[PDB]
Symmetry: C5
Subunit: 204 residues, 5 copies
């Protein structure tokens, strides 16, 4: 595993090939999670931010940007979307959490909460995922689509098996995240495929 | 009754099913009232914020959001509408009062007064209501319409049988409302139907 | 006469009936005047703010709002219009002066001077007027038009038989007008007709 | 012959007649000049700000406002135009200089330099002008065009037979110009023709 | 050579003739570079900012502005483009770096980083260039196009044979650039052709 403190993945061009695989030792289905990261892109078309598929299951956990100001979460193929005022282009800090017991999904953009939405109450997100940055999966680990590819920079990614309270979301946004047990930027197990370059983070 | 201080109702999806019934021992017709609450929604279509119907009478007291920047009050089916500059999406604090003797309706949005309008001078709002959050009634307690449903979060709801002066409206906006004798968020009698979740208020 | 300090006239609906007549013992033709008042309306269509007609003479002195950002003064049917950057909807303080000797008309909006214009140099505004708020006159006291009616609130109205200097306009904008000898909000002789309600001024 | 400190010319209406003739006793061709003045107009159509014609020569020196945000200088019938971000309507302070040796024209708007442009390198602006405010000349002292007329206010006009450096431009903008040798607001020889009124400057 | 500190090149008109040749003793192909400069133009159409061609190679290194808010870099005829929020017209400070080993191109506009893009990984930029300001080259030193010409002012140009870190980019932006070994504004060898004038820098 690798300490990526102070660094970003750069996906420097549009492709159907360039991606990073993220490896987690996650064998138990998820009832609760929070995912935070920073991104900087000047794409106006739609793109995937974080794609988690399991065997036989597309869009098992997907964070997707449909257009400026609109963020979508998919859980087990079902989707919710919330809106925010944002400048374009601009760096962003994105957190999203989901809680099975209520179905509530919370997006937080630059430390501000979006309107709560709900989906998949009682569901468990399936384990043994393939997790990809830079492309949107339609199969278990593949079937990418360049019109959904992420071109730009991603850093400071964390995933926890709990729903972070507001104080811990703000801490992540400020740069003092709680250590994370599913994915953690200070100890990330990743595989680069194609043209992805690791560079210093210069925009936070 | 339940003290919902620090909490909101979350209406997490569009539906014709999800709603909260609010119960108040209102047996005398209303001459004067003030209603305040906070709301956070990213709907662009029209929606009902507060629906009060009586037997045989639709839109006896209705607070309805036509579109961004436009707030309507219905009293006994008659309507007025006033406009305001607001960001979208954004949390809002809404107060509205009405006084039978003058017919004057006063909206206050985030502590700022809208232009006064007038309707139903001399009328008394009928008693024994069904009061619904989340859906717009067309019958006594029912006949909801998905395209008028509220999706988002509502909290800090208070209703008085008097017209509040500006200083008391500001107190409510600031989080220290005067005690309210029709509906009180700190002693609320309600019934959840369908998918409505109580969560902490994180956006004020 | 009545002291309306701290109060407004509310014209709560569109109509061809609702108006206030202002009474002044003006028997000598006017060579110079200044008129100040505050208004709050969310109409987008054209409307009359102050209508002064004399026997046989329509639009003898008329302050008219054709559209957002544009204020007109008519003197003996002739008009000038000046433009301003303003928010909509928003309360406004409006002063206008005119001087026969030069023909110069000065609008001040929220204490800011508009571009000077000129009309009717050498003319005298005729005496023995009927002065109306809420409607635009087409006869001596009447012939109103619903599509020109004022809906909203007017207060702090003063009229002087001289051209106020800038620092006196500012004093009026700040809520401390100098003594006024044609119309005076603190000793106003008026008649309400139709649906007009006096309420506290809550927006200044 | 007159000190206009604290005063403006008001051109109160559109016409093909109303203007001020400015008379300089300096009689010499111009190789270098700077011209500064303040203006306030709410016209959206094109208009002339300063028109200098010589016998048989149109547009010998012309400062012309094509549309909002665009200022043009003509030297000997040739033109340059530069752009600026400005609010509309708004008072403005305009300086423009031109240097024959380089051909460079410099506009400064409210103390801010526009992009330099170049024209007529080596040319001498002809002597013995008619200089007009309020109208655009097409002949020596005449052939005006109502659609190019200036409506509004002009004050604080100075013209020097040198190119002012930035510090002197700022001094003029701030109300402390260096004494000027072609035209000077504090010792101005002018002739009003038609409807032009001198009033105090109330907008700076 | 010449210290152009405090000065700019002014390209005062649209033309196919006016340009500056920049002379560098660069005989080894470039693997890494950073280029900074300040520009002020009110063109809305596309234009070239910095044109570097070699014998037999068009667009070997080209910095091009297609439209407001979009900056392009060509390396060996391949292009990348990144977007930024910017006012128009407005002075701008532009830096761009490129590193062959990763292919990463970094634009910085007014000291803020744009999204990184990548092109020509492993390529060497050809040596023995002709470098032109004011025009876009289509041959080795020539074949200009009026519709791509730069009209406006350029100064503070530096080019280094390395990729500058953020602190050194900010130093350039703030007016204390590090000495630069390919091109240096403080020791510049240049040739003016046509109508280009050197003037003080008045807009920084
Ligand atoms: C899921 O998260 C919620 C909110 O923090 C918490 O109340 C609950 O205990 C969590 N459930 C599990 C199984 O961890
Ligand atoms: C409603 O308000 C009016 C006007 O102030 C007041 O006179 C009246 O008593 C009020 N009605 C009730 C039932 O309190
Ligand atoms: C109107 O104003 C002018 C100029 O100030 C003055 O000369 C004249 O006397 C005034 N007319 C009156 C007071 O009726
Ligand atoms: C013209 O420009 C400047 C002074 O503004 C100066 O360098 C030059 O000598 C001037 N020439 C004349 C004719 O005064
Ligand atoms: C280009 O930059 C990289 C930065 O690490 C460096 O390793 C390489 O030597 C550079 N090439 C040259 C020719 O300096
Ligand atoms: C097909 C579908 O539902 N979605 C959601 C966004 C990505 C897209 C996809 O899986 O390609
Ligand atoms: C029909 C009508 O007047 N109204 C008012 C707003 C919603 C709508 C309704 O009751 O459905
Ligand atoms: C006819 C006319 O000139 N005007 C001016 C504005 C009101 C309108 C009117 O008198 O009805
Ligand atoms: C004809 C021409 O070139 N111009 C310049 C602006 C005014 C206009 C004119 O002289 O009327
Ligand atoms: C032809 C081409 O590829 N380009 C790139 C920008 C300018 C333009 C050119 O060389 O003219
Ligand atoms: Ca998919
Ligand atoms: Ca897909
Ligand atoms: Ca209804
Ligand atoms: Ca309905
Ligand atoms: Ca009329
Ligand atoms: Ca009329
Ligand atoms: Ca002309
Ligand atoms: Ca002309
Ligand atoms: Ca080329
Ligand atoms: Ca070309």
């Amino acid at each position: 595993h690798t300490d990526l403190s102070g660094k970003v993945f750069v996906f420097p061009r549009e492709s159907v090939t360039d991606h990073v695989n993220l490896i987690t030792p996650l064998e138990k289905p998820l009832q609760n999670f929070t995912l935070c990261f920073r991104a900087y892109s000047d794409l106006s078309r739609a793109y995937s931010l974080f794609s988690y598929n399991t065997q036989g299951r597309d869009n098992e956990l997907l964070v997707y940007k449909e257009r400026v100001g609109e963020y979508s979460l998919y859980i087990g193929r079902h989707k919710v979307t919330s809106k925010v005022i944002e400048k374009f282009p601009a760096p962003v800090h994105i957190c999203v959490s989901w809680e099975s017991s209520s179905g509530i999904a919370e997006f937080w953009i630059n430390g501000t909460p979006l309107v709560k939405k709900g989906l998949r109450q009682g569901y468990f997100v399936e384990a043994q995922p393939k997790i990809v940055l830079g492309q949107e999966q339609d199969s278990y680990g593949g079937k990418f689509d360049r019109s959904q590819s992420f071109v730009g920079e991603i850093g400071d990614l964390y995933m926890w098996d709990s729903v972070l309270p507001p104080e811990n979301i703000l801490s992540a946004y400020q740069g003092t995240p709680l250590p994370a047990n599913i994915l953690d930027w200070q100890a990330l197990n990743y595989e680069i495929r194609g043209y992805v370059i690791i560079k210093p983070l210069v925009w936070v």
